[PDB]
Amino acid sequence: SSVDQKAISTIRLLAVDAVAAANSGHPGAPLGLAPAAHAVFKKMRFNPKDTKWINRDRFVLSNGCACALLYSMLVLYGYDLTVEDLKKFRQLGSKTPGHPENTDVPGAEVTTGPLGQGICNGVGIALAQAQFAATYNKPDFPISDSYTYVFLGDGCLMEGVSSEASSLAGHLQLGNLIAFWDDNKISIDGSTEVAFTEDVIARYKSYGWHIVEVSDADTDITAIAAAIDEAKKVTNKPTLVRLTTTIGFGSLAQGTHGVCGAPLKADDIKQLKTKWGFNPEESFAVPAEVTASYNEHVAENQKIQQQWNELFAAYKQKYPELGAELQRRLDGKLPENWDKALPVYTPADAAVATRKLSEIVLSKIIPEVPEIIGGSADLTPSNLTKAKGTVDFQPAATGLGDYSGRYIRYGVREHAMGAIMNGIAAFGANYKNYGGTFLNFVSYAAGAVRLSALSEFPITWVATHDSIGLGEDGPTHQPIETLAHFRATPNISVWRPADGNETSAAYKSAIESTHTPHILALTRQNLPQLEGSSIEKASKGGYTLVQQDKADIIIVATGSEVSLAVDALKVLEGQGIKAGVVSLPDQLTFDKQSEEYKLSVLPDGVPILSVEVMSTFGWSKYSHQQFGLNRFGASGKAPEIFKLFEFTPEGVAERAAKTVAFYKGKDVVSPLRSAF
Amino acid sequence: SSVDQKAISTIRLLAVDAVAAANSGHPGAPLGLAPAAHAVFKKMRFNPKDTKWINRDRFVLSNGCACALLYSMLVLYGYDLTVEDLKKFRQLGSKTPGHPENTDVPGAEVTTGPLGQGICNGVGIALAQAQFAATYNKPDFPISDSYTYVFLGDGCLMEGVSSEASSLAGHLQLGNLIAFWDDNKISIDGSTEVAFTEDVIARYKSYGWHIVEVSDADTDITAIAAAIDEAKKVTNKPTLVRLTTTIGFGSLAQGTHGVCGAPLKADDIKQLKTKWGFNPEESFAVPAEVTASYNEHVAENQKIQQQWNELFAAYKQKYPELGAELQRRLDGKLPENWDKALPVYTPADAAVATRKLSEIVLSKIIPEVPEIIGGSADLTPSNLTKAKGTVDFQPAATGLGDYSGRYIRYGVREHAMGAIMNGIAAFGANYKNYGGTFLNFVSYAAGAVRLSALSEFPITWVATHDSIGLGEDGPTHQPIETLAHFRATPNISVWRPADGNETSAAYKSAIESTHTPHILALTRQNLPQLEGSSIEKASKGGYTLVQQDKADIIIVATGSEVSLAVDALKVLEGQGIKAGVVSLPDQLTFDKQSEEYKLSVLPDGVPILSVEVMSTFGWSKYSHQQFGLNRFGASGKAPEIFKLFEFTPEGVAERAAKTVAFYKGKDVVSPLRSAF
Ligand SMILES: Cc1ncc(C[n+]2csc(CCOP(=O)(O)OP(=O)(O)O)c2C)c(N)n1
Ligand SMILES: Cc1ncc(C[n+]2csc(CCOP(=O)(O)OP(=O)(O)O)c2C)c(N)n1
Ligand SMILES: O=C(CO)[C@@H](O)[C@H](O)COP(=O)(O)O
Ligand SMILES: O=C(CO)[C@@H](O)[C@H](O)COP(=O)(O)O
Ligand SMILES: [Ca+2]
């Protein structure tokens, strides 16, 4: 219609003008996708004034560099984002950053831009929706029936992470996921003929996706809407809608890679506007008829949400227990005193691997906290991430699980597991979700892990086999750089618990988290229960395990090296050296403590030696000398590897004694002191 | 035949016995794949006594946990690996580590185990072979005509990196790549029905691969050999051979996930041996008839290599220039004085972004060093990785390039680009190959990058847009943790050149490298030519740029922050503070210098402040105080971001002055000093 065309032109020109004002950014895909964005948002249920409505449809822009398009949609629909914000596109401190950030942009469900992530986030949103609906929906009470709409480009389809997630989403028959491929035959290097000639459609059919092809997505918004209708009929397959578009549609440079990621020339913008009936002298024009048309859809959606609120109230009357649970989750609140389920240990209990302590924690807290779900990337019997008696998340048609299940079989797909976890957290409803693999292969998922931190999502990696302690699998499996990498990433809690109490503290942090992803570095090998550990002390991230007034040295250690440090203390005593021991199960949590608390753990006037069997990077924040492993490991029985590298009570004692001698007659201040 | 069956049983039992002796490891896939390994090695051309013969067929075990199978093959064929080594499987210091390592295992082309890597390495070996053959082959001189055989499992097929590489390998029509899928319907979590139900075959057809299906790969070695013959007829498609096998074939626990990764029970091993005609009381049995049969094939292969050597000698007679070039490369030697092509700059030259300096270096050295090839992951016009006038590596049938081309269009496939680079280096012939992306997205390829370091491959990442200096794309694009991560990985040179001379030094290191991967962290933004820089000094990794006898402080910086440090020196002079400046373009290279050299750069008795606009991790090796960025970045014009975070001459000067005050009346020793 005339107003549809005008809306599409408005979107296109807002995006182009935003890029022009910044003299930076990507106008091509916004021009090519504005018809589809118009059609999809008209089909979506959402409330610009309540971005957290749990039964909203979700939209994810996986091709995040097209975000001038997303921002234009959000402005036009009256989210908390204005034309003045668009005018500050890509400007320092603005609400319109160069790639969409869920923490900064109202209506941005996730942080995208790194290619491949958004579509996987969409799989996770759709996974959560299916699980949520199976958990809460009752006859006559469709509490959850929302869709997940994803836009993606060729770039996302080239990134392996999207293949992983698309395979898994097809396997999981996620019929409320509808993704749209911007099939514009152009990427940054030029035509896709130079690097991307696969039959995408045949590939997606091989995953079990439904396909709808829209041959003229530059203009045929009727076919785009019909493709959504068709997709919604196919309740047991995610759908890929092939949008054949011209990148930069309308531009003089349409269909060229130059329109991909540079501002258009001024004269190009003038002819765009004139051909579409706009004033070439005007920027950021918003015809009131477009606002009005969009406001009609908002009003209708707000009435749908109003009715949903009444449906929820009637739900709480009919299903008081489920209803109260749901309200609690939508309030962002864990069950009262849920943490009384955390296992507690004493020094009289047996040695246990922290992977096994983790299993035991999950077995106790999963029954108490329904919003915990999680899985493993094909390492369930090694990470120990499933609680006996839970059922797998599977479409019931397979006979292998149900959508009400709580345990996800991710397969050998660490990267997509990371990004799917981000989408599950993004869904909301207080989901506290986790994913298991070996610590060394969390690195396969770095692209997503970093976005967990940037997005402030409380996801949890259950990262077992944390060190040379795993033994025979050898240096291809043994972390060296991994903790340093993730500790150097802002906003990642990297817990390396030493024993049962510390593992309960780690999970207490990970589950209570609302804005910080967690990585739990867990052992293959057994560790003793420590004298002096508790959930309370370990919850401070770092704490004095063995207090030694008159210490000649303090040894600060994590995980499996805390027990080693305690054994070294006994060797040192025989050498006439008095040591204290600090356990530092999470450096981030410790960092957040008060300066006085931190100085009580790492005081002035005593040399401090760190001990952790991987990179020494970062450890100078907490120590004067560092005993770590800065070379790759070895394939052998773990105790022999530790002996080889002198991570023995005697080897630690030797380096502690050298540290005491090194600082003899020097003044020593806490590593916590800084010049600035 | 009878001896074929006996060889297959020998292989199976060597593998099972190796796992049994270690009481650790994976017997299931070795049992299921021994028939195929027997058939493939019989088709392969190789010399156990010359593992570097450049026209050998290559074999890659992508499912590296099956390496008891690889080791058994290598022992049986008389590589420098014995039955005594097998008996030390997974034992500290042995030549039979738990996953195959090219540095430790004769006949292991690459380091595998991390799933997905090997098949991508195979794509790279096959890419190099195609390029090598196109470069050197002449009529009547098939210098290079070898195949690349890869075994892989379901796990590798689930990992996104293999999808990337398989898409690209199909695009590249790599007809000498033959991969074999162990289709045994089992992974660690159980049946593949729980997580991996895609139509693998249809997917591979969608990439343009040829398919051969072997329905009984437990016994039909005739069909496996015929599938190789068929694959070799299809010269314009890589082939996937579907091997339908029983995991753990023969074991009481065959076809169960328990046979995947745990030693078999002793009684199981007894019945294996009895059913196949072996002595259940005997371990590591090697029937001499199997040795003999295998030695016949070796002798035939050695005669093929002998004839190849004569073909090469005749080649050098007919094509003296090409022949001498080829001999030089097979000797591992760069062209004499190739480095005289490196650009050199003075302080009178204009400011240049180090990405552009990189382009200029490549434009000068590519014509001089034919063994340089490389590409970009769809960022060619942003990384600036193509030299004008080179042609792309493409099958000529596309019209878009030729296999003699030297520039690879990797598409948006960073992880596979990493692992393909490892395979290109693994091919040998002195290939010095590179791959461009933004530094922040090198992290997508961490799984492969770590294996570059562990494998000692001289690959090069051309990693542009290294910091907040890139500006508007914002925090999803700006590295914070990235250098710390890779610097904390053993054996990665992480060059962050400050100017033209330093960028030439970085490439001199990267191209001369034979055992160390390089990451070149390069700027989007322009940087000045520094007074005091040179290729000679920067080649030391760290060097005194501005010497100040009587320094009150030394500022050590890298890349874009070296110019900042020099500007801070001028501010400090006005505040009555004398500073020196150290440039540290590669910490690893610097670390390898003599202790006296390093102390001349970072002396005792002077506080040292580091300045680098990302994580402060690692910097305490070189400084007393660290000025870095330990939070995510921001979307804005780069100079405004630097101002926001006070990476300005005044902000650096302020922190330098606080550092001088902090150490007033303290004794200061070089950060290079250690207690142990
Ligand atoms: C993981 C990752 N790699 C590389 C980039 C850089 N990049 C942004 S867009 C883009 C091109 C992808 O092309 P396409 O998705 O087809 O976008 P279109 O040009 O059609 O808008 C690339 C390589 C990125 N943002 N993330
Ligand atoms: C990147 C990566 N993720 C996880 C692992 C752990 N792992 C080793 S084998 C394996 C199972 C893969 O199953 P499959 O390849 O089908 O091997 P099969 O059991 O049939 O021998 C897993 C998950 C790994 N080695 N590398
Ligand atoms: O080794 C691998 C990865 O290649 C897995 O098969 C697990 O390592 C199984 O062993 P556990 O450590 O769980 O006992
Ligand atoms: O921004 C992206 C990645 O999303 C690319 O489109 C490049 O950033 C293009 O800009 P230059 O920095 O090369 O000028
Ligand atoms: Ca495209």
Ligand SMILES: [Ca+2]
């Ligand atoms: Ca399998």
